[PDB]
Design a protein around this motif. Structure first.
Motif, PDB file in Angstrom:
ATOM      1  N   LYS A  72       0.854  -1.192   0.000  1.00 13.99           N
ATOM      2  CA  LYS A  72       0.000   0.000   0.000  1.00 13.99           C
ATOM      3  C   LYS A  72       0.886   1.236   0.000  1.00 13.99           C
ATOM      4  O   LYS A  72       1.955   1.234   0.587  1.00 13.99           O
ATOM      5  CB  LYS A  72      -0.937   0.000   1.201  1.00 13.99           C
ATOM      6  CG  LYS A  72      -1.820  -1.254   1.331  1.00 13.99           C
ATOM      7  CD  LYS A  72      -2.612  -1.556   0.082  1.00 13.99           C
ATOM      8  CE  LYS A  72      -3.695  -2.628   0.326  1.00 13.99           C
ATOM      9  NZ  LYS A  72      -3.127  -3.889   0.878  1.00 13.99           N
ATOM     10  N   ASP A  74       0.395   5.739  -0.455  1.00 12.83           N
ATOM     11  CA  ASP A  74      -0.409   6.902  -0.748  1.00 12.83           C
ATOM     12  C   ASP A  74       0.289   7.765  -1.792  1.00 12.83           C
ATOM     13  O   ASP A  74       0.817   8.819  -1.494  1.00 12.83           O
ATOM     14  CB  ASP A  74      -0.662   7.677   0.540  1.00 12.83           C
ATOM     15  CG  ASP A  74      -1.793   8.663   0.410  1.00 12.83           C
ATOM     16  OD1 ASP A  74      -2.223   9.005  -0.745  1.00 12.83           O
ATOM     17  OD2 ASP A  74      -2.238   9.083   1.489  1.00 12.83           O
ATOM     18  N   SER A  76      -0.869   9.594  -4.090  1.00 11.45           N
ATOM     19  CA  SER A  76      -1.451  10.905  -4.242  1.00 11.45           C
ATOM     20  C   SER A  76      -0.854  11.907  -3.242  1.00 11.45           C
ATOM     21  O   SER A  76      -0.529  13.044  -3.577  1.00 11.45           O
ATOM     22  CB  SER A  76      -2.941  10.798  -4.052  1.00 11.45           C
ATOM     23  OG  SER A  76      -3.488  12.072  -4.083  1.00 11.45           O
ATOM     24  N   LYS A  82       0.559   7.287 -10.201  1.00  7.60           N
ATOM     25  CA  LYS A  82       0.418   5.913  -9.761  1.00  7.60           C
ATOM     26  C   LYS A  82       1.344   4.908 -10.482  1.00  7.60           C
ATOM     27  O   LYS A  82       1.886   3.986  -9.863  1.00  7.60           O
ATOM     28  CB  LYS A  82      -1.042   5.440  -9.892  1.00  7.60           C
ATOM     29  CG  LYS A  82      -1.206   4.046  -9.235  1.00  7.60           C
ATOM     30  CD  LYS A  82      -2.616   3.590  -9.071  1.00  7.60           C
ATOM     31  CE  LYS A  82      -2.659   2.376  -8.170  1.00  7.60           C
ATOM     32  NZ  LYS A  82      -1.901   1.234  -8.676  1.00  7.60           N
ATOM     33  N   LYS A 457      -7.321  13.862   1.546  1.00  5.21           N
ATOM     34  CA  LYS A 457      -8.526  13.255   0.956  1.00  5.21           C
ATOM     35  C   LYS A 457      -9.655  13.312   1.946  1.00  5.21           C
ATOM     36  O   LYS A 457      -9.523  12.836   3.076  1.00  5.21           O
ATOM     37  CB  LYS A 457      -8.311  11.767   0.675  1.00  5.21           C
ATOM     38  CG  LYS A 457      -7.258  11.453  -0.332  1.00  5.21           C
ATOM     39  CD  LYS A 457      -7.635  11.980  -1.683  1.00  5.21           C
ATOM     40  CE  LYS A 457      -6.832  11.346  -2.800  1.00  5.21           C
ATOM     41  NZ  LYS A 457      -7.546  10.169  -3.383  1.00  5.21           N
ATOM     42  N   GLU A 583      -3.815   6.888   2.916  1.00  2.00           N
ATOM     43  CA  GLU A 583      -4.701   6.140   2.047  1.00  2.00           C
ATOM     44  C   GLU A 583      -3.988   4.842   1.654  1.00  2.00           C
ATOM     45  O   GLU A 583      -2.826   4.871   1.251  1.00  2.00           O
ATOM     46  CB  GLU A 583      -4.982   6.981   0.812  1.00  2.00           C
ATOM     47  CG  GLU A 583      -6.042   6.426  -0.117  1.00  2.00           C
ATOM     48  CD  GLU A 583      -6.470   7.432  -1.204  1.00  2.00           C
ATOM     49  OE1 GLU A 583      -5.907   8.556  -1.307  1.00  2.00           O
ATOM     50  OE2 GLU A 583      -7.386   7.083  -1.961  1.00  2.00           O
ATOM     51  N   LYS A 584      -4.689   3.714   1.725  1.00  2.00           N
ATOM     52  CA  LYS A 584      -4.064   2.408   1.527  1.00  2.00           C
ATOM     53  C   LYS A 584      -4.359   1.842   0.146  1.00  2.00           C
ATOM     54  O   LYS A 584      -4.968   0.802  -0.010  1.00  2.00           O
ATOM     55  CB  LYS A 584      -4.480   1.460   2.641  1.00  2.00           C
ATOM     56  CG  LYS A 584      -4.430   2.151   3.988  1.00  2.00           C
ATOM     57  CD  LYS A 584      -4.308   1.194   5.160  1.00  2.00           C
ATOM     58  CE  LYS A 584      -2.853   1.083   5.603  1.00  2.00           C
ATOM     59  NZ  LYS A 584      -2.687   0.114   6.734  1.00  2.00           N
ATOM     60  N   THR A 585      -3.891   2.556  -0.861  1.00  2.95           N
ATOM     61  CA  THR A 585      -4.059   2.178  -2.255  1.00  2.95           C
ATOM     62  C   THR A 585      -2.889   1.237  -2.669  1.00  2.95           C
ATOM     63  O   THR A 585      -1.713   1.570  -2.480  1.00  2.95           O
ATOM     64  CB  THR A 585      -4.093   3.451  -3.136  1.00  2.95           C
ATOM     65  OG1 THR A 585      -2.975   4.285  -2.802  1.00  2.95           O
ATOM     66  CG2 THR A 585      -5.342   4.246  -2.880  1.00  2.95           C
ATOM     67  N   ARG A 586      -3.232   0.066  -3.207  1.00  6.87           N
ATOM     68  CA  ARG A 586      -2.254  -0.919  -3.622  1.00  6.87           C
ATOM     69  C   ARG A 586      -1.499  -0.416  -4.839  1.00  6.87           C
ATOM     70  O   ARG A 586      -2.109  -0.023  -5.820  1.00  6.87           O
ATOM     71  CB  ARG A 586      -2.936  -2.253  -3.959  1.00  6.87           C
ATOM     72  CG  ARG A 586      -2.020  -3.252  -4.655  1.00  6.87           C
ATOM     73  CD  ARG A 586      -2.767  -4.542  -4.912  1.00  6.87           C
ATOM     74  NE  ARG A 586      -2.018  -5.454  -5.792  1.00  6.87           N
ATOM     75  CZ  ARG A 586      -1.049  -6.273  -5.396  1.00  6.87           C
ATOM     76  NH1 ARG A 586      -0.649  -6.304  -4.125  1.00  6.87           N
ATOM     77  NH2 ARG A 586      -0.469  -7.076  -6.276  1.00  6.87           N
ATOM     78  N   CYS A 587      -0.173  -0.429  -4.760  1.00 10.07           N
ATOM     79  CA  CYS A 587       0.705  -0.112  -5.895  1.00 10.07           C
ATOM     80  C   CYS A 587       1.710  -1.261  -6.006  1.00 10.07           C
ATOM     81  O   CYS A 587       2.589  -1.414  -5.149  1.00 10.07           O
ATOM     82  CB  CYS A 587       1.438   1.201  -5.650  1.00 10.07           C
ATOM     83  SG  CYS A 587       0.426   2.643  -5.292  1.00 10.07           S
TER      84      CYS A 587
END
Lengths: 907, 914
Positions: A72, A74, A76, A82, A457, A583-587
Motif C-alpha cells: 500500500k 499513498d 497521491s 500511480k 482526501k 490512504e491504503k491504495t495498492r501499488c
C-alpha cells in the motif's frame, strides 16, 4: 559537554503485530511473541519450503515476522503518478510514509522545517535488501517489459526531495549494523554542526519469495526454531523479521532551546571492525568490547551506572556467548559486581530485522525510558547453557519490571545498545533518559485555543478524526501542547478544519459532529473549514479585537506559513500526536494472484506433465511425446536402491492416467489402466530421455508404447499400457478382497500380529540399500497379517513440484507401493530381493489422499518365477482411493532359489 | 596545528578502460585519447538487445560505452578463497579487492605494515550504483533449482577489511553519481577527527550483465545519438555510461608528512549539499551546487582566483552542463571580475560517466595533472556548448596538453604566488552534490634517504611460482623507464608489498647489477655473481637458496628472517634515514576466470521466452492428438511479434508472405524432406483487415503422400470459433527442375541494370516513404527502412535493406524474413499506386510455386514483372535477389484481388499491362 550529546526528538516506524509505536510498547511490555507464518496474501510458503539446504531453490526459513500492507502507498499524498509508484521499490514508498510519521511525531511539518532550518536536514538509512527489481527482470525473461525497483540511494533522496531538504542524504550499508551506523554518523554530523537535524533509520522487508531463498542459502538462519531465543536456548541460527524505523536526531543544546520532546540523550557512540580473524562471518569479542569501552568513555560513564543493555541477541549457539563475553570484558575491568544490569533484545519479540536491528533496539529502549519499565526479553526462560550469567553483570529479564534508578550516588537510567554485523562491523552507543521540563504546557490564553486538522482526501477525514478522538480520551497532555503541535507539527494539506474550543469535552463533541458529517458548531465550540478538494467552505466570521482571526483566516485560505507561535506567551514543549492515516491504495507491479517462477520454475511449468514434457507428434497417426530425464528436475520421483537410482514403475501408471487429457479424450471420466514392462532399469543414472507413442485403437481405447534411451545408445523399449474409460458397468468388488482388507486394517488400528514401527520400517529399507531423500523418505507403520500386509504413508506437506495439476497417482504413493512390495519380499525371506514389476492389470485411481493412507496387499500367490497380488490404497476414512486387480512381480534367479515357499501368505 | 585539518592522498589505484596501469591512463589523458568502445563481443552480442529508441521495451538504446578488461578474472588463490565461492561472488567485490591491494601497495603499505604501524586501524569506504550479478542465480532459479549468486553491497568494503584484518570503519555508501566523492568526503572527516588512521576510499561501475544496460536505458538519462560524452561541448543530448574502479588511500597531512609517504595531493576543503526544493527529482539547483563550492573554498581558506583547474562533473547533458557552469560562475564571480583564467575539463570526455566512480575518476586525473604539472585536454569540445557563454566566466576548456603554471595575483596590494590548486565537483541525479579543493604538495629534498649501498637488497614475493617470471618482467620493464634512487625502490619493496609465500632477494649496489640479476632470474637462472647475490625460499616447491652466516653483516639477520617467512621484519633499521615511499608496479594477479555461467551463455534477456519457447515465431507449440495430422497453435500477441505487424488504414497488418515462411518451416517441424529445396503454393480464403482482434492461429499439417505436405491454417478472435484463413501445399524440388524461363530472367536483368544506372522513372527512398504515408501505412519499429523504386516498361524493382537490429534474434528457422515479406507488400502497393490506385488495398489471394533458395544476408531487390489483369485479378511473377544478384526467392505467380471500383480505376493502357 552538551554540544557533544545528541537528543532523539522524534520516533516512528512500522513493526509486526502493531499499528502504532504505542501498540509496539504494549506487545513488548506484555511479552508478546510477534513472529508469524509467511503470510498467504504474499505467496504460498508451502510451495517453496524445504526442511534443509540440500534442495537448491527451496527455502529453509520456517517463519518470520511481517508488517501489514507492504503493497500500500499513498501515491497521491506524495505527488507521484500511480504508474510511477507501481514501479518503485516498497523500500522507498514505506520509508517515505515512516519519514512523515517521524517528523510529525517530533512536531515538525514540512513547512516548519523550511521556516526553522530552510530545509537543512539530513536523511541517513540502510537496508540489506531491495528485491523489487526482480519483478521487471523476470517479466523481461518472458517478454519486453518495464524494469522495476529503485536504487538504494533513491530511498533517502526521495525523502529529501519530498521534504525539500538540503542536508546530507545518504544510503549506508554495514549489514546488520546499518541503522546503528546511520545513527552514529548522524551524531557526528550534528556534533560538528554540518546540518541541524538528521533523520536516521533502516528497514528490512521480505515481499518477494526469492528473498527467502537467498536468505536460506546464506546459511545463517535456523532450520528448527520459530523464535529468536535471545540469550536463551541457542539455535543453529537466527530468524529474520520485517520492520521500518526512524528517529529524528538533533544536537542536545538546540533540542533544549527548541523545547522538543526528548525521548533520550545519546552520550556516546562508537564503531569498530572485527579485524583479523579466521572466517568472514566470525566475530572477535575484543573488538566488540572496544566499541563498548569507547562509547562509555565518550559518555564519561562508569559501567556500574548502566542498568540496561539492549543487546544484539541474535539467538545463535555461538554468537550469543561471544556477545556476552564482549560485554563482560567491557564491564569487569571497572567492577566485580555481578547481575546488577538487565540484558535483553527486541529480537526475541519480532526477530532479526537485519539493517533495521539497531533502530528496532533503540525504539524499545526509548520506550523503556518513557515508561520507566524494563520489558521482558522473551524465549529465555531457560538461559543459554554456554553462558554463566552468575559471573556476569547481567540478568535477562523474564517479566515486566520497574526500571529503578540504580544507587551505587543515585544514577539516572542509562542503557547501552549494541548492533553487530556478520561481516565485521560493530556499533555500541550509550543512551540516557532526560526529564520532562516543569513548564512543558506553555502559556496561551484560553480564548486563543484552536485545534487545526488537515487531510489530503476527504474520504479519510472521518478516520483521521476518529483516530485523534480516541487518542484524546486517554491522553494526559495539556490542551496547549496539543494545539501547538497540531499547528506546527502536521503537514498542512488541502482539506482544512479548525475547532475553536477550550475544553476536552467541547473538542470531543465537535470531533463527533465532524465524524458524523454535519459539522454543526456547538455552543462550546466553533467549527470552521475550507475543503479545497470539494470547494466547501464554512467561513470564519472574523473579529477586530482577536489575534487569532487573521492567523486562522490565512490557514483556512491555504497559506503554508502562519505565525501560530505569536499566540503563545511561552511555546509548549512538543508532544507525540497520532500518526496521519495514509490512504491504503495498492501499488504493485503484478496482479494479486501472481506467483513468481521462483515458486513454480520452468522445469515444472514448461512441461505437459512431470514425466511428459513436450508433444513432438508428426503428421503420421499417433501422438508422440518426449522428455529429457534430468534427475534434479525430478526430485519427487527418483530414489536410490542397491545397484542404482530408481523410479517406481507405478509412476508410469500415472502417465497412462494423464494421457487421455493430453489427447483431449475420455474427458471427465475415471479410467482403468493396464501396463506391461519389457525391461528393468536397475540404474536410471545414465538415462537421458523418455519417449511415448499414443495411439487411438477405437473410441473406447488408447495404447501407449514407451521407451527410454541413454547417451550414445539407440532407444530401448520400456513398456506398453492400455487405457480405458471407466463406468457403472464394471462388477462389484469381490467380497473376499474387502474382508481381507477389513481384517488387515483392523489389526493395524489394534496392532495385532507381526507389527513394525515406522522406525523399524526405515531400518529394513536402510539395510536393503534404499535412500529416499529428499522427498520420499517419510515411512509408515507396517502390519503383517495372516492374509497380507498394510503399510501406511503420509505425503509430505512440502514436495518438489507444486505446479502440476495432472498427477493422479503421486510419486510418493508410487514409491510407498515400491516399499510395501519390498517389505513383502523381505517378509518372504528375501531381505535383499529386487522389486521388478512385470505387469499391472486394471488399476483405477480416484486420487492420492492429502492425509495418511494405507497400502494393502492381499491375494498373494507364487507361480514359476512370478509373485502376483492385489493392492488397494485406502485413505484415513477408509475410502478406497486406488484399486488394482493384479500386480505381477518378476523374481530373478536368486529370488526364486531363496524365496520361502512355506510361508502362510503363499499357501 | 592547521595541517591537521588537511588530508593527504598517499596512494592511488584503479582499473580504467584503455589502460593497463594508472601511468597508461595518464598517457591517454595527456594525449587526448577517446577510450570509448563498442559493447564487447566477449560479453554479449549487443546487436541482439540494441534498439534506437525507448519505444521497444526490453531493448537498450545504449549505443556504446567504455569497458575494463578481464571483468571475469579473479585471483581466488591470492585471496584465500575456494574457487566455487569466487564463482558466485560479485565481480564488484572481487575486482575492488584487487584494486584495494594495488592502492595499499601503491602507497607503500603491505598488510604486515598496516598491522605493525596501526594495528589495522584503517577504514574502507566505497560505493556503486550497480551490482547485478545476482541475476545469474535468479535467472537460473526461474528454470531449475540453482545456487543464488552475488554479494550484498556491504560485502564489498568488508571483504577488503577482512582480507587486510582492518579494524576501522568499513562502509558502503550510495549517493548515486556522487558516491565515491561522498566516501572521500566522509573519509576526510573521520581522519580529521582522528577516528582512524587511514582510509581507503573509492567507487566503481561495471556493466557485465546485459540487463544492466536495459535498466539504464529505461532510466532515460543517456544519449540515444552520441557515442561520446561531450563535456562542455556541442551535441550534448544525454550522457554515456563507462566502467571503472578507483580508490585512494587517505591519511591526515601531518601524519603523512611525518611518515614520509608519497603525497600526491592535499584535500584542503570538502563540502556536500543536497538540491533541496525543486521541480523534478532529477532536476538540479545551481545555487546548492554553488553553496558546496563556496563551503569547500572557505574551508580550504582559498580565494577563487587561486584556483587554476576545475575537474567538472561534465556529464554532457543539454541541461546539466550549462547549469553546472552557472553554479561554478556564481561560486567565483563574487570574488573576481577576471574571465577565462581557470581551466575546466572532465575525464568523462575520455572514458564516459562512471556513475558512483565518477568522482574518484576525476580525482585520479587531477592528481596526475599535479604529478606532471600539466593540464590535459578535455576532448569532444572543439565546438563549445552554444548555451554557455564561456567569455562571461572564469573558465576555458583546454583543447591541448598545456603546462600548468602556478598562478600568480597581486591581491589587495600583495603578490601572491599560489600552488597548483583544483576544485573537483561530482553531482548526483537525485540531489547530492560534492565539491572538494585539492592542492599540489612538494617533493621532499632528501626523499632518497640514506643507507650504505652494501645494505641494498631488492626483495620480491609471489603467491604462485608460475607467475614469478611475469611479475619480475613487469618490475624490470618499469625499472628501465625509472630513475628513482635505489634506496627508495629497496625500501618500498621492503615495506610496501604484501609478503607472499615465494620469496626472492637480489643483493647489489647498482642499477646495472640489479638489471643483470633480474634478467637472470626471469630466465630461471638464479645464480649469484660478483656484482649480485641472489637468495630465495619458495615455500610452494620448497626450493631454498639461503644466505650464509655473517656475524658482521647487518643485512644477514633481517634477510634470513624474511626468507624464512617472518612477517615482522625491521627493514627500517638498515636506513640512517628512511626513504620516501614511491609507486612501484602493480602485482600481476593470476587471471583465472570465475563466473557463474560457461562462456557462450546468453541470458533470456538477450533471447526472451516469447522467442525461445516457440518452435517458430508464428508457430508456438505442437498440440497434436493421436489422429493423423499434426496440429500446432500460437497465441497472437502483437508485442511478441514486433518483427511482423505493421499498421495501415484498416488496422493492424501482417504480410501474407509470412505464411509462405511458415509453410517452409513445416517439413523440418515434421521430420520430412531434410536438406531438400522446397516449393510452396498457398491460397488465402479470407483477408484480415485488422489483426488487433486476432487472439490465436491454428495449423493443421497432413501428409498426402511420400512427396507432399498440406497445411491448413486458421485464426480465432476472442469468443469466436476458428475462421479459416488459407491453405498451403509443400513439395520438395527434384533436380528434374527446369531453369527459369528466359524472358523472365531478361526482364529481371534489364530492371536491375536500370536500378544500378538510376535510369528512367525512379522514386527516391523519401518519395516511396510518402507514397506509403499518404496511403496510411506505418512500419515502425522494425519494418521501416523504405528503399528506392525503379519503374521500367515491363516491371519494377524495390530495394530492401533489413536493419541490423530486429526484434527476434533467436529463431533459426526463418527463411523468408518478415522484413522481406513486408518489403514485398510495399512493392505490391507501389505497383497499385503506379497503375492508378494510390489508395489500393493489397489483398493476396494466391501464391503459386514459391522457392526460397537462400536467405539474403543483407540488401536485396524485389522485382515484379509479367503483370496482367484478368477479370478482378492482378497477377505477376516475382524474384528476390541479393547484392550479388543471386536469386534468393523466385515465385511464378502472385494473384492479387481487386474490388470492382479498383478494377474500374486501373489504367488499362499502362505499359506494365501492354
Amino acid at each position: 559537554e552538551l554540544a557533544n550529546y545528541i537528543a532523539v526528538i522524534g520516533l516512528g516506524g512500522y513493526y509486526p503485530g502493531a499499528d502504532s509505536i504505542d501498540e509496539l510498547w504494549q506487545n513488548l511490555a506484555n511479552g508478546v511473541d510477534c513472529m508469524s507464518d509467511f503470510p498467504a496474501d504474499r505467496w504460498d510458503h508451502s510451495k517453496i519450503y524445504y526442511k534443509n539446504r540440500k534442495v537448491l531453490g527451496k527455502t529453509t526459513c520456517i517463519n518470520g515476522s511481517f508488517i501489514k500492507d507492504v503493497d500500500k502507498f499513498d501515491y497521491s499524498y506524495f505527488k507521484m503518478p500511480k504508474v510511477y509508484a507501481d514501479h518503485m521499490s516498497p523500500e522507498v514508498r514505506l520509508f517515505l510514509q515512516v519519514a512523515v510519521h517521524t517528523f510529525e511525531d517530533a512536531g515538525y511539518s514540512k513547512e516548519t522545517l523550511l521556516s526553522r532550518y530552510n530545509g537543512d536536514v539530513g536523511v541517513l538509512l540502510g537496508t540489506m535488501s531491495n528485491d523489487y527489481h526482480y519483478y521487471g527482470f523476470e517479466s523481461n525473461v518472458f517478454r519486453g517489459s518495464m524494469a522495476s525497483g529503485s536504487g538504494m540511494a533513491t530511498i533517502p533522496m526521495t525523502v529529501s526531495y519530498f521534504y525539500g531538504l538540503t542536508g546530507p542524504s545518504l544510503f549506508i550499508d554495514t549489514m546488520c549494523s546499518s541503522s546503528s551506523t546511520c545513527i552514529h554518523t548522524a551524531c557526528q554530523m550534528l556534533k560538528h554542526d554540518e546540518t541541524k537535524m538528521v533523520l536516521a533509520g533502516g528497514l528490512n522487508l521480505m515481499y518477494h519469495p526469492y528473498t527467502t531463498v537467498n536468505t536460506s542459502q546464506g546459511n545463517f538462519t535456523s532450520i528448527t526454531s520459530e523464535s529468536v531465543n535471545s540469550y536463551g536456548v541457542g539455535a543453529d541460527g537466527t530468524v529474520i523479521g520485517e520492520g521500518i524505523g526512524a528517529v529524528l536526531l538533533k544536537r542536545l543544546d538546540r533540542a533544549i532551546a527548541d523545547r522538543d520532546q526528548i525521548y533520550g540523550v545519546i552520550k556516546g557512540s562508537a564503531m569498530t571492525n572485527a579485524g583479523e580473524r579466521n572466517g568472514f562471518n566470525v566475530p572477535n569479542p575484543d573488538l566488540q568490547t572496544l566499541a563498548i569501552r569507547q562509547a562509555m568513555d565518550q559518555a564519561k560513564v562508569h559501567p556500574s551506572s548502566i542498568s540496561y543493555i539492549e543487546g544484539h541477541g541474535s539467538g545463535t549457539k555461538l554468537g550469543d556467548p561471544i556477545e556476552v563475553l564482549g560485554l563482560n570484558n567491557a564491564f569487569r575491568w571497572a567492577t566485580d559486581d555481578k547481575q546488577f544490569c538487565y540484558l535483553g533484545s527486541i529480537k526475541s519479540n519480532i526477530g532479526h530485522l537485519l539493517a533495521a536491528s539497531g533502530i528496532a533496539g533503540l525504539t524499545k529502549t526509548l520506550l523503556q525510558f518513557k515508561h520507566k519499565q524494563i520489558a521482558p526479553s522473551i524465549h529465555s526462560s531457560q538461559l543459554n547453557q554456554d553462558i554463566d550469567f552468575a559471573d556476569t553483570p547481567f540478568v535477562v529479564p523474564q517479566q515486566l519490571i520497574e526500571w529503578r534508578q540504580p544507587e551505587r550516588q543515585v544514577f539516572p537510567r542509562r542503557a547501552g545498545l549494541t548492533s553487530i554485523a556478520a561481516g565485521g562491523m560493530n556499533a555500541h552507543m550509550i543512551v540516557e533518559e532526560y526529564p520532562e521540563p516543569a513548564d512543558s504546557a506553555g502559556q496561551i490564553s484560553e480564548d486563543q485555543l484552536v485545534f487545526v486538522f488537515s487531510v489530503h482526501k476527504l474520504a479519510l477525514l472521518a478516520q483521521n478524526l476518529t483516530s485523534f478522538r480516541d487518542w484524546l480520551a486517554s491522553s494526559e497532555a495539556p490542551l496547549a501542547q496539543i494545539a501547538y503541535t497540531l499547528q506546527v507539527g502536521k503537514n498542512n494539506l488541502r482539506n482544512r478544519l479548525a475547532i475553536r474550543c477550550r475544553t476536552r469535552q467541547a473538542l470531543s463533541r465537535a470531533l463527533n459532529a465532524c465524524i458524523d458529517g454535519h459539522y454543526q458548531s456547538s455552543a462550546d465550540s466553533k467549527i470552521f473549514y475550507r475543503f479545497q478538494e470539494s470547494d466547501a467552505v464554512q467561513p470564519l466570521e472574523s473579529d477586530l479585537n482577536d489575534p487569532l482571526a487573521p492567523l486562522l483566516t490565512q490557514w483556512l485560505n491555504g497559506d503554508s506559513q502562519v505565525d501560530w507561535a505569536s499566540l503563545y506567551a511561552q511555546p509548549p514543549v512538543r508532544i507525540s500526536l497520532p500518526a496521519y492515516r495514509f490512504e491504503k491504495t495498492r501499488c504493485w507491479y503484478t496482479e494479486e494472484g501472481y506467483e513468481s517462477s521462483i515458486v513454480n520454475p520452468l522445469m515444472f511449468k514448461n512441461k505437459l506433465h512431470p514425466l511428459v514434457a513436450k508433444n513432438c507428434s508428426t503428421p503420421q497417426p499417433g501422438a508422440i511425446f518426449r522428455t529429457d530425464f534430468v534427475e534434479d528436475e525430478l526430485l519427487d520421483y527418483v530414489y536410490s536402491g542397491r545397484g542404482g537410482r530408481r523410479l517406481s514403475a507405478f509412476n508410469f501408471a500415472d502417465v497412462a492416467l494423464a494421457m487421455p487429457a493430453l489427447a483431449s479424450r475420455f474427458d471427465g471420466r475415471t479410467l482403468s489402466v493396464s501396463c506391461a514392462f519389457e525391461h528393468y532399469i536397475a540404474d536410471w543414472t545414465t538415462v537421458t530421455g523418455l519417449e511415448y507413442r499414443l495411439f487411438e485403437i477405437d473410441s473406447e481405447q488408447l495404447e501407449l508404447e514407451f521407451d527410454f534411451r541413454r547417451s550414445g545408445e539407440q532407444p530401448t523399449h520400456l513398456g506398453f499400457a492400455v487405457i480405458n474409460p471407466l463406468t457403472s458397468d464394471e462388477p462389484p468388488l469381490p467380497q473376499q478382497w474387502l474382508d481381507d482388507a477389513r481384517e488387515l486394517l483392523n489389526r493395524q488400528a489394534l496392532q495385532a500380529g507381526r507389527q513394525l514401527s515406522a522406525a523399524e520400517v526405515s531400518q529394513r529399507l536402510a539395510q536393503a540399500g534404499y535412500d529416499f531423500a529428499p522427498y520420499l523418505d517419510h515411512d509408515g507403520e507396517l502390519t503383517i497379517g495372516r492374509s497380507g500386509l498394510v503399510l501406511k504413508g503420509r505425503p509430505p506437506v512440502n514436495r518438489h513440484n507444486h505446479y502440476a495439476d495432472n498427477v493422479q497417482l503421486s510419486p510418493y504413493l508410487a514409491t510407498t507401493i515400491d516399499k510395501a512390495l519390498y517389505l513383502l519380499l523381505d517378509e518372504l525371506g528375501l531381505p535383499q530381493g529386487r522389486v521388478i514389476v512385470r505387469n499391472i492389470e486394471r488399476l483405477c485411481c480416484y486420487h492420492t489422499p492429502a492425509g495418511g493412507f494405507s497400502v494393502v496387499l492381499s491375494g498373494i500367490g507364487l507361480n514359476d518365477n512370478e509373485l502376483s497380488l492385489s493392492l488397494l490404497v485406502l485413505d484415513e476414512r477408509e475410502q478406497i482411493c486406488v484399486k488394482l486387480d493384479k500386480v505381477s512381480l518378476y523374481l530373478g534367479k536368486q529370488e526364486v532359489a531363496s524365496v520361502d515357499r512355506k510361508h502362510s501368505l503363499l499357501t
